[PDB]
């Protein structure tokens, strides 16, 4: 394959305004 | 607007990673409403609010809005991140909890800066001097009078001058130039593919050159497919120099030009 794909990207969850 | 171009709060760590911010929150006890401020690593002029609650870390991106105010997505705007933090110490207003206790920089720890932040003021000075033919006070006044616009421009162009950026060179030229000299793992460059903000990351892994696509989406954000999104290439390079995050390995030494 000509361009390498990303493997398993680390979990990187951003918090949102809520309640 | 911030009082200065740089943040100066005792609980601002500059451009530390999420992981370094979490390590500092653990060092500070991970008490509910313990918090620090860091520079956003993927939003230009942005910040991130890292706060402990429920023995977990919660991370909020604070964007710089077009008018020079700051806001978490969908929140009220504030003059500065200092104002944002003081406000959220009085009203939760959507945050997981009240901010109770700033975690301050330990004694003699300074805010972290990246390569770009260390070059930024001098790149702007050189641009105004050469474009407008100004010296001394006049130069200083001109920088100040257009500081915000100058910061946006230098951010969009600064990559061109940085050691890992080789401009418009072919896939073949890139493999050839990366394989010259010591086959140091993580040796890398970025090249342009067109004039329409499409690039490639070329990375040396066990004596073989890998190519990853870098694309500008419809927002103006650069990313490797399925990857973290950035406003600038220098942000992308700083991120993938800290951790692989899906690459076969972390970026190390920038491939020297010729």
UniProtKB/Swiss-Prot annotation, chain A:
The disease tied to this protein in UniProt is: Immunodeficiency 17: An autosomal recessive primary immunodeficiency characterized by highly variable clinical severity. Some patients have onset of severe recurrent infections in early infancy that may be lethal, whereas others may be only mildly affected or essentially asymptomatic into young adulthood. More severely affected patients may have evidence of autoimmune disease or enteropathy. The immunologic pattern is similar among patients, showing partial T-cell lymphopenia, decreased amounts of the CD3 complex, and impaired proliferative responses to T-cell receptor dependent stimuli.
Q: How is it modified after translation?
A: Phosphorylated on Tyr residues after T-cell receptor triggering by LCK in association with CD4/CD8. Phosphorylated also by PKC; leading to the TCR complex down-regulation. Phosphorylated on Tyr residues after T-cell receptor triggering by LCK in association with CD4/CD8.
Where in the full protein does the shown chain start and end, and how long is the full protein? 158 to 176 of 182
Task: Enumerate the spans annotated as ITAM domain.
Answer: 1-19
**Annotated function:** Part of the TCR-CD3 complex present on T-lymphocyte cell surface that plays an essential role in adaptive immune response. When antigen presenting cells (APCs) activate T-cell receptor (TCR), TCR-mediated signals are transmitted across the cell membrane by the CD3 chains CD3D, CD3E, CD3G and CD3Z. All CD3 chains contain immunoreceptor tyrosine-based activation motifs (ITAMs) in their cytoplasmic domain. Upon TCR engagement, these motifs become phosphorylated by Src family protein tyrosine kinases LCK and FYN, resulting in the activation of downstream signaling pathways.
Protein localization: Cell membrane
Task: Give the consequence of mutating residue 3 to A.
Answer: Abolishes lysosomal targeting
Q: According to its record, what is known about the domains? A: A di-leucine motif and a tyrosine-based motif are individually sufficient to induce both endocytosis and delivery to lysosomes.
Known partners and oligomeric status: The TCR-CD3 complex is composed of a CD3D/CD3E and a CD3G/CD3E heterodimers that preferentially associate with TCRalpha and TCRbeta, respectively, to form TCRalpha/CD3E/CD3G and TCRbeta/CD3G/CD3E trimers. In turn, the hexamer interacts with CD3Z homodimer to form the TCR-CD3 complex. Alternatively, TCRalpha and TCRbeta can be replaced by TCRgamma and TCRdelta.
Which gene is the coding source of this polypeptide chain? CD3G
Could you identify this protein by its name? T-cell surface glycoprotein CD3 gamma chain
UniProtKB/Swiss-Prot annotation, chain B:
Domain SH2 span(s) in chain numbering = 11-103, 164-255
The PTM Phosphoserine maps to: 40, 198
- In the record, Phosphotyrosine modifications are located at 24, 43, 127
Which cell locations does it reside in? Cell membrane; Cytoplasm, Cytosol
Q: In which tissues is it expressed?
A: Widely expressed in hematopoietic cells (at protein level). Expressed in neutrophils (at protein level). Within the B-cell compartment, expressed from pro- and pre-B cells to plasma cells.
Q: What is the recorded post-translational modification?
A: Ubiquitinated by CBLB after BCR activation; which promotes proteasomal degradation. Autophosphorylated. Phosphorylated on tyrosine residues by LYN following receptors engagement. Phosphorylated on tyrosine residues in response to IL15.
Quick one: where's region Interdomain A?
104-163
Q: Give residue numbers for the modification (Phosphothreonine).
A: 252
Q: What is known of its domains?
A: The SH2 domains mediate the interaction of SYK with the phosphorylated ITAM domains of transmembrane proteins. Some proteins like CLEC1B have a partial ITAM domain (also called hemITAM) containing a single YxxL motif. The interaction with SYK requires CLEC1B homodimerization.
Known function? Non-receptor tyrosine kinase which mediates signal transduction downstream of a variety of transmembrane receptors including classical immunoreceptors like the B-cell receptor (BCR). Regulates several biological processes including innate and adaptive immunity, cell adhesion, osteoclast maturation, platelet activation and vascular development. Assembles into signaling complexes with activated receptors at the plasma membrane via interaction between its SH2 domains and the receptor tyrosine-phosphorylated ITAM domains.
- Assembly description: Interacts with LYN; phosphorylates SYK. Interacts with RHOH (phosphorylated); regulates mast cells activation. Interacts with NFAM1 (phosphorylated); probably involved in BCR signaling. Interacts with VAV1 (via SH2 domain); phosphorylates VAV1 upon BCR activation. Interacts with GAB2 (phosphorylated); probably involved in IgE Fc receptor signaling. Interacts (via its SH2 domains) with CD79A (via its phosphorylated ITAM domain); the interaction stimulates SYK autophosphorylation and activation. Interacts with FCRL3.
Family named by the database record: Belongs to the protein kinase superfamily. Tyr protein kinase family. SYK/ZAP-70 subfamily.
Provide the disease association from the record. Answer: Immunodeficiency 82 with systemic inflammation: An autosomal dominant immunologic disorder with onset in early childhood. It is characterized by recurrent infections with various organisms, and multi-organ inflammation that manifests as colitis, hepatitis, arthritis and dermatitis. Patients have a propensity for the development of lymphoma, usually in adulthood. Disease severity is variable.
Could you tell me what this protein is called? Tyrosine-protein kinase SYK
This chain's source organism reads Homo sapiens (Human)
* Source organism phylogeny: Eukaryota, Metazoa, Chordata, Craniata, Vertebrata
Question: What fragment of the whole protein does this chain represent?
Answer: 6 to 262 of 635
